[PDB]
Design a protein around this ligand. Sequence first.
Ligand SMILES: Nc1ncnc2c1ncn2[C@@H]1O[C@H](COS(=O)(=O)NC(=O)[C@@H](N)CO)[C@@H](O)[C@H]1O
Ligand SMILES: Nc1ncnc2c1ncn2[C@@H]1O[C@H](COS(=O)(=O)NC(=O)[C@@H](N)CO)[C@@H](O)[C@H]1O
Ligand SMILES: Nc1ncnc2c1ncn2[C@@H]1O[C@H](COS(=O)(=O)NC(=O)[C@@H](N)CO)[C@@H](O)[C@H]1O
Ligand SMILES: Nc1ncnc2c1ncn2[C@@H]1O[C@H](COS(=O)(=O)NC(=O)[C@@H](N)CO)[C@@H](O)[C@H]1O
Ligand SMILES: [Zn+2]
Ligand SMILES: [Zn+2]
Lengths: 417, 416
Amino acid sequence: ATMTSMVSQRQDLFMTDPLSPGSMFFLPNGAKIFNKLIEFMKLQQKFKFGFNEVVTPLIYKKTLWEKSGHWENYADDMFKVETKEEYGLKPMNCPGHCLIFGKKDRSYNELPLRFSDFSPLHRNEASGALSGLTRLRKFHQDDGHIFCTPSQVKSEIFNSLKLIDIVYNKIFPFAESNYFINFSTRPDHFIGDLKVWNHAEQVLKEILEESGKPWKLNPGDGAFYGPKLDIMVTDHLRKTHQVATIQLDFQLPERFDLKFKDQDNSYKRPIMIHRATFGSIERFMALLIDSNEGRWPFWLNPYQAVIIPVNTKNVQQLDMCTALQKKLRNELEADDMEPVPLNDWHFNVDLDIRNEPVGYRIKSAILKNYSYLIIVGDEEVQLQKYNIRERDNRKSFEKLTMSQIWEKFIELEKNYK
Amino acid sequence: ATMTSMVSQRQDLFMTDPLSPGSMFFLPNGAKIFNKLIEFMKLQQKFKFGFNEVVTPLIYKKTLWEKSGHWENYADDMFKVETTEKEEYGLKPMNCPGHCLIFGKKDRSYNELPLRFSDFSPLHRNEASGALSGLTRLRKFHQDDGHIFCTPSQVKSEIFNSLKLIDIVYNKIFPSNYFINFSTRPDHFIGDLKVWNHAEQVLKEILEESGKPWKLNPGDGAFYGPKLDIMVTDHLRKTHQVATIQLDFQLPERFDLKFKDQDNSYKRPIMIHRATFGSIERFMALLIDSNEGRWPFWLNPYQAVIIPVNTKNVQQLDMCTALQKKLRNELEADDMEPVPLNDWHFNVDLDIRNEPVGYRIKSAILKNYSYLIIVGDEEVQLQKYNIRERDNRKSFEKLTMSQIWEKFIELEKNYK
Ligand SMILES: Nc1ncnc2c1ncn2[C@@H]1O[C@H](COS(=O)(=O)NC(=O)[C@@H](N)CO)[C@@H](O)[C@H]1O
Ligand SMILES: Nc1ncnc2c1ncn2[C@@H]1O[C@H](COS(=O)(=O)NC(=O)[C@@H](N)CO)[C@@H](O)[C@H]1O
Ligand SMILES: Nc1ncnc2c1ncn2[C@@H]1O[C@H](COS(=O)(=O)NC(=O)[C@@H](N)CO)[C@@H](O)[C@H]1O
Ligand SMILES: Nc1ncnc2c1ncn2[C@@H]1O[C@H](COS(=O)(=O)NC(=O)[C@@H](N)CO)[C@@H](O)[C@H]1O
Ligand SMILES: [Zn+2]
Ligand SMILES: [Zn+2]
């Protein structure tokens, strides 16, 4: 029994199976949230923070991992693929993005060059370390790599902090006291020179102090390629978890011999910034469950609304419920050829017509954590209005029409509420 | 293949590297089209054809691939993973066995049927190095995969519905446009020969009731069942297998899949394997092979380009930058206001290069921008924009910022 077990059971979110341990199954309801969080992050990355999404391979030749230093300094966590050339299943996206950078000639005008990647990653974690969605063998990162110049680093990290603030302080609050930063310094197994490393830590520390973010030193817990700014979120058992991370990399550009044409018409190395906001879609989703206990916001809820007729055998009530569900689900027939258009609204509304008392079905709804409960009795049929209430306030009853509820549910998603 | 390679360099679509043979790289513009197609398919699958997307693991133990029968029929065309006991894993070449596990985790009723699962996971097939060809044959690819669990009574209607989706893609949105290859029992097949002949009998009737063109492609069916292979032709008149409908009576028996019928008796569900694009990669390769870079507006990574006649004219830029701001619909990275769901965003570039206005038009015809927007002082005086289509030279029009905004939206709300 873990951090997400009860809610996963109750809402049919995920599934494990001993034929692929450490990897897990997103059931239809669980996948909706997975896709919604990604959809959110893509919008922020593409239309506000200037990222360009790429899709990269999963397996690469051993020779690549030897460049990046993963093959030696990350051998404990890397899966190896075989069919006389040996391959590695990627635990990270960075080398693939380095190949992208080095494929063409790069101008200083292209910088900062930002790539994002939602590829599934594989890390051979120890069987004991495995735990729920927080630590998996397979997972997806909202990964991003920024190639920039020395004068662009400070502003790029601040931008990454802004997106982090929107996520952890505005959209998914768990102002301040939502997270603190671990200043993770040079580990025991590292690549590169100490001169470079000390410079890297100076730069990062200096930026860390301008941000004014709560922080503490986490000595010898950086990456083998660079020092990190690890966003730490605390759960209900007062245990911290690393989610978002900002990593300063002077090493991989040299390892891959990356270069760009600068203003002085000379070739210099780009500076590489590793960053993710969720960290992984899985772990971040696990920490949401730990805090909301299944009580999702409307825009994220797999159970957005349930319509409950008082008398399940009353045809008048049923027509009224059936109509609203059709309206809110907004779904076409497989009979014709009319395709589902883009940017249209579809809501996860259900219909409880089990032959059980209305009170039992309402209690059943609140247990499943439906964001809204819509009840239809005779008074509703007469008024042609639906008695809609909020999940977390049983005195939020109001009578709206089919149109009003439709427009209400839209204003909720356009406000991320 | 080399037209794909031609368009790719022009529009910066894809990329390969000898560090990963058979695996594609999707550069920003290339990944955009990739995402658009998936976005289109997900919409039709969820809101019109009653599918439910799941996310399944990419590696499973050797055990599963024996239970499914892939470990003997595929283990050459399958990657193996090395773990810490020492049970070996297999990088999945298909999604099917993983969906059987899902069906056989909860007890199932006849009420849940037809039960449909969709999956867009990346697949890995260790193809021959000499079989590799651009985006058509890769070692890594994504399928718009689907799996239906139904009763024998439902197979007919359920395969038709899959054809209705096929009719949309190939005859309406991305255009006989195809014929069906009736692939029958392969040599290395599994299961009882009795149920095979039955499956091929039912599949033929459905194929006959359809009224769609088909040839017999004997011995090229799947080891787990006969398949309706949808074939599309090149400009070189060569055929390619994209969409497919496969009737499985075997895998449900391999996994001992049961469901409760209405008479309270337990029976086996029937598996229908299906993809409409087949793979996004191969499907993309055939669009490029057909349009030669001339993308539709809703798929184009180059939707519009704004060209000011005098690149030093402050007023012309103020009017050009205003339209680009409007059309792109972005936000600033220095505030806390999030990009909202279901807003519109268009790929509009701004050509302020110090070159004659004609040279910057030539440079956009070759980029295959769906629309060319031009601003001179004649337009500045009118506060209207001079816009033309790509494929019609005499298409020029004078619209406002609001008009172009709504025009572009309508094109996207119609898959135009
Ligand atoms: N085994 C795991 N399971 C789930 N999530 C993980 C796992 N390992 C790391 N993460 C998440 O992914 C984030 C990034 O991990 S990281 O190793 O520190 N950083 C990277 O791998 C770089 N590729 C970042 O671009 C972590 O902060 C954490 O939120
Ligand atoms: N916000 C809630 N949290 C927990 N349980 C609730 C909540 N709201 C209602 N219930 C439970 O659901 C059941 C219904 O309670 S009720 O208010 O009296 N029911 C009704 O008002 C309607 N059935 C009448 O039309 C009770 O078991 C109650 O305890
Ligand atoms: N190596 C490949 N590269 C690109 N696309 C491929 C490749 N192999 C198959 N496909 C595409 O994917 C489709 C499905 O492949 S299939 O083998 O015939 N069908 C399956 O594997 C089943 N899992 C479908 O449910 C093909 O019709 C083709 O369009
Ligand atoms: N659809 C097209 N296909 C090929 N070439 C084109 C096309 N449209 C324009 N061009 C080329 O682009 C150049 C500019 O054409 S043009 O219409 O006459 N240019 C102008 O009118 C501008 N100078 C004034 O606004 C010419 O070389 C022309 O041959
Ligand atoms: Zn990285
Ligand atoms: Zn299949």
